[PDB]
PDB file of all heavy atoms in Angstrom:
ATOM      1  N   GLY A   1     162.275 222.188 -70.918  1.00 32.57           N
ATOM      2  CA  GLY A   1     160.947 221.738 -70.389  1.00 32.57           C
ATOM      3  C   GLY A   1     160.314 222.767 -69.482  1.00 32.57           C
ATOM      4  O   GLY A   1     160.885 223.868 -69.255  1.00 32.57           O
ATOM      5  N   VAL A   2     159.108 222.531 -68.982  1.00 34.17           N
ATOM      6  CA  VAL A   2     158.279 223.416 -68.107  1.00 34.17           C
ATOM      7  C   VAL A   2     157.194 222.588 -67.432  1.00 34.17           C
ATOM      8  O   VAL A   2     156.774 221.602 -67.987  1.00 34.17           O
ATOM      9  CB  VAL A   2     157.727 224.647 -68.916  1.00 34.17           C
ATOM     10  CG1 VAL A   2     156.719 224.221 -70.013  1.00 34.17           C
ATOM     11  CG2 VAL A   2     157.066 225.713 -68.010  1.00 34.17           C
ATOM     12  N   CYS A   3     156.746 223.039 -66.281  1.00 32.65           N
ATOM     13  CA  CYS A   3     155.600 222.441 -65.571  1.00 32.65           C
ATOM     14  C   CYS A   3     154.314 223.266 -65.901  1.00 32.65           C
ATOM     15  O   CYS A   3     154.271 224.447 -65.572  1.00 32.65           O
ATOM     16  CB  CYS A   3     155.883 222.408 -64.055  1.00 32.65           C
ATOM     17  SG  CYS A   3     154.518 221.926 -62.995  1.00 32.65           S
ATOM     18  N   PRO A   4     153.258 222.672 -66.517  1.00 33.88           N
ATOM     19  CA  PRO A   4     151.993 223.280 -66.790  1.00 33.88           C
ATOM     20  C   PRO A   4     151.291 223.795 -65.523  1.00 33.88           C
ATOM     21  O   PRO A   4     151.437 223.225 -64.438  1.00 33.88           O
ATOM     22  CB  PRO A   4     151.152 222.218 -67.515  1.00 33.88           C
ATOM     23  CG  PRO A   4     152.179 221.357 -68.182  1.00 33.88           C
ATOM     24  CD  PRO A   4     153.294 221.343 -67.212  1.00 33.88           C
ATOM     25  N   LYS A   5     150.497 224.864 -65.661  1.00 34.77           N
ATOM     26  CA  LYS A   5     149.841 225.580 -64.581  1.00 34.77           C
ATOM     27  C   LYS A   5     148.614 224.882 -64.015  1.00 34.77           C
ATOM     28  O   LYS A   5     147.746 225.480 -63.338  1.00 34.77           O
ATOM     29  CB  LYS A   5     149.558 227.039 -65.031  1.00 34.77           C
ATOM     30  CG  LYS A   5     150.820 227.825 -65.350  1.00 34.77           C
ATOM     31  CD  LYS A   5     150.484 229.279 -65.774  1.00 34.77           C
ATOM     32  CE  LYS A   5     151.743 230.047 -66.093  1.00 34.77           C
ATOM     33  NZ  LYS A   5     151.424 231.481 -66.500  1.00 34.77           N
ATOM     34  N   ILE A   6     148.442 223.553 -64.281  1.00 36.52           N
ATOM     35  CA  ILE A   6     147.288 222.733 -63.880  1.00 36.52           C
ATOM     36  C   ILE A   6     147.400 222.300 -62.440  1.00 36.52           C
ATOM     37  O   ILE A   6     148.444 222.244 -61.811  1.00 36.52           O
ATOM     38  CB  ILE A   6     147.181 221.535 -64.855  1.00 36.52           C
ATOM     39  CG1 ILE A   6     148.352 220.526 -64.693  1.00 36.52           C
ATOM     40  CG2 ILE A   6     146.997 222.023 -66.281  1.00 36.52           C
ATOM     41  CD1 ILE A   6     148.260 219.313 -65.650  1.00 36.52           C
ATOM     42  N   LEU A   7     146.239 221.882 -61.853  1.00 37.21           N
ATOM     43  CA  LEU A   7     146.116 221.224 -60.533  1.00 37.21           C
ATOM     44  C   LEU A   7     145.852 219.725 -60.723  1.00 37.21           C
ATOM     45  O   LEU A   7     144.718 219.286 -60.808  1.00 37.21           O
ATOM     46  CB  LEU A   7     145.075 221.978 -59.686  1.00 37.21           C
ATOM     47  CG  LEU A   7     144.980 221.489 -58.227  1.00 37.21           C
ATOM     48  CD1 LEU A   7     146.278 221.684 -57.382  1.00 37.21           C
ATOM     49  CD2 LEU A   7     143.823 222.231 -57.531  1.00 37.21           C
ATOM     50  N   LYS A   8     146.897 218.929 -60.910  1.00 34.72           N
ATOM     51  CA  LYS A   8     146.858 217.484 -61.168  1.00 34.72           C
ATOM     52  C   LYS A   8     147.336 216.696 -59.900  1.00 34.72           C
ATOM     53  O   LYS A   8     148.382 216.967 -59.397  1.00 34.72           O
ATOM     54  CB  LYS A   8     147.756 217.191 -62.369  1.00 34.72           C
ATOM     55  CG  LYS A   8     147.556 215.729 -62.848  1.00 34.72           C
ATOM     56  CD  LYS A   8     148.455 215.460 -64.052  1.00 34.72           C
ATOM     57  CE  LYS A   8     148.092 214.079 -64.721  1.00 34.72           C
ATOM     58  NZ  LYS A   8     148.414 212.928 -63.819  1.00 34.72           N
ATOM     59  N   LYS A   9     146.523 215.749 -59.418  1.00 34.59           N
ATOM     60  CA  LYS A   9     146.922 214.927 -58.250  1.00 34.59           C
ATOM     61  C   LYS A   9     148.029 213.948 -58.602  1.00 34.59           C
ATOM     62  O   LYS A   9     148.264 213.574 -59.756  1.00 34.59           O
ATOM     63  CB  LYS A   9     145.670 214.244 -57.696  1.00 34.59           C
ATOM     64  CG  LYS A   9     145.010 213.251 -58.649  1.00 34.59           C
ATOM     65  CD  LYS A   9     143.783 212.509 -58.056  1.00 34.59           C
ATOM     66  CE  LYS A   9     142.620 213.475 -57.734  1.00 34.59           C
ATOM     67  NZ  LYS A   9     141.463 212.737 -57.199  1.00 34.59           N
ATOM     68  N   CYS A  10     148.751 213.451 -57.541  1.00 32.61           N
ATOM     69  CA  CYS A  10     149.910 212.606 -57.693  1.00 32.61           C
ATOM     70  C   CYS A  10     150.266 211.757 -56.398  1.00 32.61           C
ATOM     71  O   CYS A  10     149.940 212.185 -55.276  1.00 32.61           O
ATOM     72  CB  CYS A  10     151.104 213.398 -58.109  1.00 32.61           C
ATOM     73  SG  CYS A  10     151.570 214.746 -56.995  1.00 32.61           S
ATOM     74  N   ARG A  11     150.887 210.620 -56.602  1.00 37.31           N
ATOM     75  CA  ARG A  11     151.515 209.787 -55.583  1.00 37.31           C
ATOM     76  C   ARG A  11     152.995 210.045 -55.477  1.00 37.31           C
ATOM     77  O   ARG A  11     153.596 209.880 -54.405  1.00 37.31           O
ATOM     78  CB  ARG A  11     151.320 208.284 -55.999  1.00 37.31           C
ATOM     79  CG  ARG A  11     149.853 207.872 -56.156  1.00 37.31           C
ATOM     80  CD  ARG A  11     149.689 206.510 -56.914  1.00 37.31           C
ATOM     81  NE  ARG A  11     150.169 206.628 -58.327  1.00 37.31           N
ATOM     82  CZ  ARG A  11     150.230 205.630 -59.199  1.00 37.31           C
ATOM     83  NH1 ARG A  11     149.902 204.399 -58.902  1.00 37.31           N
ATOM     84  NH2 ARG A  11     150.605 205.904 -60.442  1.00 37.31           N
ATOM     85  N   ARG A  12     153.627 210.452 -56.599  1.00 38.12           N
ATOM     86  CA  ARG A  12     155.033 210.681 -56.862  1.00 38.12           C
ATOM     87  C   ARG A  12     155.253 211.406 -58.199  1.00 38.12           C
ATOM     88  O   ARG A  12     154.303 211.584 -58.989  1.00 38.12           O
ATOM     89  CB  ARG A  12     155.855 209.358 -56.765  1.00 38.12           C
ATOM     90  CG  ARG A  12     155.327 208.288 -57.769  1.00 38.12           C
ATOM     91  CD  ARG A  12     156.256 207.035 -57.850  1.00 38.12           C
ATOM     92  NE  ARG A  12     157.483 207.352 -58.518  1.00 38.12           N
ATOM     93  CZ  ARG A  12     158.728 207.484 -57.986  1.00 38.12           C
ATOM     94  NH1 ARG A  12     158.938 207.318 -56.711  1.00 38.12           N
ATOM     95  NH2 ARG A  12     159.707 207.734 -58.788  1.00 38.12           N
ATOM     96  N   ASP A  13     156.482 211.826 -58.491  1.00 40.39           N
ATOM     97  CA  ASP A  13     156.872 212.630 -59.646  1.00 40.39           C
ATOM     98  C   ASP A  13     156.495 211.944 -61.008  1.00 40.39           C
ATOM     99  O   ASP A  13     156.233 212.647 -61.995  1.00 40.39           O
ATOM    100  CB  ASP A  13     158.372 212.932 -59.624  1.00 40.39           C
ATOM    101  CG  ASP A  13     158.859 213.540 -58.305  1.00 40.39           C
ATOM    102  OD1 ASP A  13     158.211 214.473 -57.806  1.00 40.39           O
ATOM    103  OD2 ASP A  13     159.877 213.034 -57.763  1.00 40.39           O
ATOM    104  N   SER A  14     156.473 210.630 -61.059  1.00 40.48           N
ATOM    105  CA  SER A  14     156.070 209.869 -62.201  1.00 40.48           C
ATOM    106  C   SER A  14     154.650 210.081 -62.673  1.00 40.48           C
ATOM    107  O   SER A  14     154.305 209.758 -63.813  1.00 40.48           O
ATOM    108  CB  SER A  14     156.262 208.335 -61.866  1.00 40.48           C
ATOM    109  OG  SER A  14     157.542 208.070 -61.395  1.00 40.48           O
ATOM    110  N   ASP A  15     153.725 210.656 -61.829  1.00 41.87           N
ATOM    111  CA  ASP A  15     152.360 211.005 -62.160  1.00 41.87           C
ATOM    112  C   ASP A  15     152.284 212.430 -62.759  1.00 41.87           C
ATOM    113  O   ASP A  15     151.211 212.835 -63.264  1.00 41.87           O
ATOM    114  CB  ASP A  15     151.462 210.917 -60.927  1.00 41.87           C
ATOM    115  CG  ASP A  15     151.247 209.459 -60.392  1.00 41.87           C
ATOM    116  OD1 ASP A  15     151.077 208.567 -61.238  1.00 41.87           O
ATOM    117  OD2 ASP A  15     151.182 209.328 -59.144  1.00 41.87           O
ATOM    118  N   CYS A  16     153.366 213.233 -62.676  1.00 42.30           N
ATOM    119  CA  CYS A  16     153.368 214.647 -63.064  1.00 42.30           C
ATOM    120  C   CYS A  16     153.996 214.900 -64.444  1.00 42.30           C
ATOM    121  O   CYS A  16     155.037 214.319 -64.776  1.00 42.30           O
ATOM    122  CB  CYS A  16     154.105 215.413 -61.939  1.00 42.30           C
ATOM    123  SG  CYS A  16     153.243 215.327 -60.346  1.00 42.30           S
ATOM    124  N   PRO A  17     153.371 215.798 -65.259  1.00 41.03           N
ATOM    125  CA  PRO A  17     153.726 215.986 -66.674  1.00 41.03           C
ATOM    126  C   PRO A  17     154.836 217.023 -66.875  1.00 41.03           C
ATOM    127  O   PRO A  17     155.003 217.927 -66.056  1.00 41.03           O
ATOM    128  CB  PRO A  17     152.402 216.420 -67.301  1.00 41.03           C
ATOM    129  CG  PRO A  17     151.823 217.318 -66.244  1.00 41.03           C
ATOM    130  CD  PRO A  17     152.147 216.564 -64.987  1.00 41.03           C
ATOM    131  N   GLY A  18     155.564 216.921 -67.968  1.00 41.33           N
ATOM    132  CA  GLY A  18     156.631 217.854 -68.341  1.00 41.33           C
ATOM    133  C   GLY A  18     157.748 217.912 -67.253  1.00 41.33           C
ATOM    134  O   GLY A  18     158.327 216.875 -66.968  1.00 41.33           O
ATOM    135  N   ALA A  19     157.978 219.074 -66.715  1.00 42.17           N
ATOM    136  CA  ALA A  19     158.957 219.320 -65.643  1.00 42.17           C
ATOM    137  C   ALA A  19     158.338 219.342 -64.263  1.00 42.17           C
ATOM    138  O   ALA A  19     158.978 219.590 -63.253  1.00 42.17           O
ATOM    139  CB  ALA A  19     159.752 220.590 -65.927  1.00 42.17           C
ATOM    140  N   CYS A  20     157.007 219.020 -64.115  1.00 42.30           N
ATOM    141  CA  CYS A  20     156.313 219.036 -62.785  1.00 42.30           C
ATOM    142  C   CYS A  20     156.883 217.899 -61.893  1.00 42.30           C
ATOM    143  O   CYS A  20     157.144 216.781 -62.335  1.00 42.30           O
ATOM    144  CB  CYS A  20     154.771 218.862 -62.953  1.00 42.30           C
ATOM    145  SG  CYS A  20     153.857 220.177 -63.808  1.00 42.30           S
ATOM    146  N   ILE A  21     156.907 218.193 -60.577  1.00 45.49           N
ATOM    147  CA  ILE A  21     157.206 217.245 -59.482  1.00 45.49           C
ATOM    148  C   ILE A  21     155.973 217.174 -58.549  1.00 45.49           C
ATOM    149  O   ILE A  21     155.224 218.104 -58.445  1.00 45.49           O
ATOM    150  CB  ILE A  21     158.500 217.691 -58.782  1.00 45.49           C
ATOM    151  CG1 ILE A  21     158.472 219.159 -58.280  1.00 45.49           C
ATOM    152  CG2 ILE A  21     159.712 217.441 -59.665  1.00 45.49           C
ATOM    153  CD1 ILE A  21     159.623 219.505 -57.282  1.00 45.49           C
ATOM    154  N   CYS A  22     155.878 216.061 -57.776  1.00 44.44           N
ATOM    155  CA  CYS A  22     154.814 215.904 -56.818  1.00 44.44           C
ATOM    156  C   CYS A  22     155.116 216.635 -55.503  1.00 44.44           C
ATOM    157  O   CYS A  22     156.180 216.451 -54.929  1.00 44.44           O
ATOM    158  CB  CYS A  22     154.580 214.392 -56.592  1.00 44.44           C
ATOM    159  SG  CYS A  22     152.978 214.010 -55.742  1.00 44.44           S
ATOM    160  N   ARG A  23     154.223 217.503 -55.042  1.00 44.91           N
ATOM    161  CA  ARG A  23     154.345 218.333 -53.838  1.00 44.91           C
ATOM    162  C   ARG A  23     153.647 217.697 -52.648  1.00 44.91           C
ATOM    163  O   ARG A  23     152.864 216.735 -52.763  1.00 44.91           O
ATOM    164  CB  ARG A  23     153.813 219.764 -54.119  1.00 44.91           C
ATOM    165  CG  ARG A  23     154.389 220.418 -55.380  1.00 44.91           C
ATOM    166  CD  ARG A  23     155.929 220.368 -55.551  1.00 44.91           C
ATOM    167  NE  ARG A  23     156.699 220.953 -54.453  1.00 44.91           N
ATOM    168  CZ  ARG A  23     157.629 220.396 -53.704  1.00 44.91           C
ATOM    169  NH1 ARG A  23     158.013 219.142 -53.863  1.00 44.91           N
ATOM    170  NH2 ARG A  23     158.215 221.075 -52.746  1.00 44.91           N
ATOM    171  N   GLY A  24     153.886 218.226 -51.419  1.00 45.30           N
ATOM    172  CA  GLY A  24     153.468 217.634 -50.134  1.00 45.30           C
ATOM    173  C   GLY A  24     151.959 217.677 -49.881  1.00 45.30           C
ATOM    174  O   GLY A  24     151.457 216.878 -49.081  1.00 45.30           O
ATOM    175  N   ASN A  25     151.193 218.448 -50.644  1.00 46.01           N
ATOM    176  CA  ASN A  25     149.716 218.464 -50.684  1.00 46.01           C
ATOM    177  C   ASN A  25     149.063 217.317 -51.524  1.00 46.01           C
ATOM    178  O   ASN A  25     147.889 217.135 -51.515  1.00 46.01           O
ATOM    179  CB  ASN A  25     149.234 219.846 -51.194  1.00 46.01           C
ATOM    180  CG  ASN A  25     149.524 220.132 -52.641  1.00 46.01           C
ATOM    181  OD1 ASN A  25     150.297 219.453 -53.317  1.00 46.01           O
ATOM    182  ND2 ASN A  25     148.915 221.182 -53.215  1.00 46.01           N
ATOM    183  N   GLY A  26     149.930 216.525 -52.231  1.00 44.22           N
ATOM    184  CA  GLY A  26     149.481 215.435 -53.107  1.00 44.22           C
ATOM    185  C   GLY A  26     149.181 215.880 -54.554  1.00 44.22           C
ATOM    186  O   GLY A  26     148.448 215.108 -55.264  1.00 44.22           O
ATOM    187  N   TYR A  27     149.630 216.996 -55.004  1.00 45.02           N
ATOM    188  CA  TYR A  27     149.433 217.545 -56.375  1.00 45.02           C
ATOM    189  C   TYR A  27     150.761 217.978 -57.045  1.00 45.02           C
ATOM    190  O   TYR A  27     151.730 218.295 -56.361  1.00 45.02           O
ATOM    191  CB  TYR A  27     148.423 218.677 -56.373  1.00 45.02           C
ATOM    192  CG  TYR A  27     146.970 218.262 -56.178  1.00 45.02           C
ATOM    193  CD1 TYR A  27     146.512 217.756 -54.912  1.00 45.02           C
ATOM    194  CD2 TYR A  27     146.107 218.249 -57.278  1.00 45.02           C
ATOM    195  CE1 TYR A  27     145.231 217.276 -54.795  1.00 45.02           C
ATOM    196  CE2 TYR A  27     144.802 217.749 -57.141  1.00 45.02           C
ATOM    197  CZ  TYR A  27     144.337 217.235 -55.900  1.00 45.02           C
ATOM    198  OH  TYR A  27     143.099 216.701 -55.804  1.00 45.02           O
ATOM    199  N   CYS A  28     150.781 217.996 -58.364  1.00 47.43           N
ATOM    200  CA  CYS A  28     151.900 218.361 -59.205  1.00 47.43           C
ATOM    201  C   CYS A  28     152.204 219.910 -59.193  1.00 47.43           C
ATOM    202  O   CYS A  28     151.264 220.720 -59.259  1.00 47.43           O
ATOM    203  CB  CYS A  28     151.661 217.887 -60.653  1.00 47.43           C
ATOM    204  SG  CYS A  28     151.395 216.117 -60.753  1.00 47.43           S
ATOM    205  N   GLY A  29     153.479 220.285 -59.103  1.00 47.98           N
ATOM    206  CA  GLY A  29     153.951 221.684 -59.131  1.00 47.98           C
ATOM    207  C   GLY A  29     155.405 221.808 -59.522  1.00 47.98           C
ATOM    208  O   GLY A  29     156.023 220.861 -59.933  1.00 47.98           O
TER     209      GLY A  29
END
């Protein structure tokens, strides 16, 4: 897997695609 280079908002890791996790700014990384 891999996390895409997008700026996607999130509440938690379940909102984030591929291997992305939710970061402290409220976006996937």
